[PDB]
Design a protein around this ligand. Structure first.
Ligand code: HEM
Length: 291
């Protein structure tokens, strides 16, 4: 499969900046969701899940075709809970009917990160909606009950190397697990709707205890009320991941720089960009615009 990026006919930077401003203003207004964490974490989780279905060997899945709108992908067990992010964005899609699905789903994640004080993520437009029969089968997103070898191997299908996997994983500063969605329960940190290197400082500084939860799954619990999944705890069990973890715990700016580069790559996998295509857009925040 080749998936060539096609700009939505007639639109420039200012059109997309309006869609960003619409999403960001609604993040600000609907601040009560999930005990006042707000919708920003479930929106960066949605953008990673529509992207993480990619397979580098046959170019199927990935963010291009906006296939999450289809039933098979929408009802994937691993996607439980993302329907709230979908419903958040649906009024915005009626307001800007010209944006493709894959571009709206992916721009939600970018807007969420930047509005939660994160790095600027360069974004590119041009995803095109593809038919229901291009919807990837369920089962391509990662399990949480596994080790660092599973993780390295999983991420190689999206050709992410070790540095990109540890940078990406730090999105755990945002949000929390929810027992009814995943069988896991609790946050990774205390400031869970501000983007910081907190995930790394908690993994290195807390006294973690392995326990089973009410769903009979294991997770690492700390006295502070935080949690870590088996796949998260893996990052300090592996010698190669652990040195990168320490690097981000001592330098949030290196973490912001690497997260930025890796998250754009995750959102662009499986998409060819012609070089007549626009350069990647760096969107201004509400705050930079005085809004
Ligand atoms: C091996 C990798 C990963 C696994 C096993 C994994 C697993 C999970 C699980 C089980 C949840 C909780 C779902 C719920 O109950 O609501 C979760 C949440 C989340 N994940 Fe990951 N994750 C992985 C990678 C990533 C990556 C690469 C990102 C982002 C770049 C990410 C971002 C998030 C965010 C922000 C949440 C919180 C969502 C919320 O608050 O509702 N995850 N993840």
């Amino acid at each position: 499969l080749v998936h060539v990026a096609s700009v939505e006919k007639g639109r420039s930077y200012e059109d997309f900046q309006k869609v960003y401003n619409a999403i960001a203003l609604k993040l600000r207004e609907d601040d009560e969701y999930d005990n006042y964490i707000g919708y920003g974490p479930v929106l960066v989780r949605l953008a990673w899940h529509i992207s993480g279905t990619w397979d580098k060997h046959d170019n199927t899945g990935g963010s291009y075709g906006g296939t999450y709108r289809f039933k098979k992908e929408f009802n994937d067990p691993s996607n439980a809970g993302l329907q709230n992010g979908f419903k958040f964005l649906e009024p915005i899609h009626k307001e800007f009917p010209w944006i493709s699905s894959g571009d709206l789903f992916s721009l939600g994640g970018v807007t969420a990160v930047q509005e939660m004080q994160g790095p600027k993520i360069p974004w590119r437009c041009g995803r095109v909606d593809t038919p229901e029969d291009t919807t990837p089968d369920n089962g391509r997103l990662p399990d949480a009950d596994k080790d660092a070898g599973y993780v390295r191997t999983f991420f190689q299908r999206l050709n992410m190397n070790d540095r990109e996997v540890v940078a990406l994983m730090g999105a755990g500063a945002l949000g929390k697990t929810h027992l009814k969605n995943s069988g896991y329960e609790g946050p990774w940190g205390a400031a869970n709707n501000v983007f910081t290197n907190e995930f790394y400082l908690n993994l290195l500084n807390e006294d973690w205890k392995l326990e089973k939860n009410d769903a009979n799954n294991e997770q690492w619990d700390s006295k502070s009320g935080y949690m870590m999944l088996p796949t998260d705890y893996s990052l300090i069990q592996d010698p190669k991941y652990l040195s990168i973890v320490k690097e981000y715990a001592n330098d949030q700016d290196k973490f912001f720089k690497d997260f930025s580069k890796a998250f754009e790559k995750l959102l662009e996998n499986g998409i060819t960009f012609p070089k007549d295509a626009p350069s990647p857009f760096i969107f201004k925040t509400l705050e930079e615009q005085g809004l």
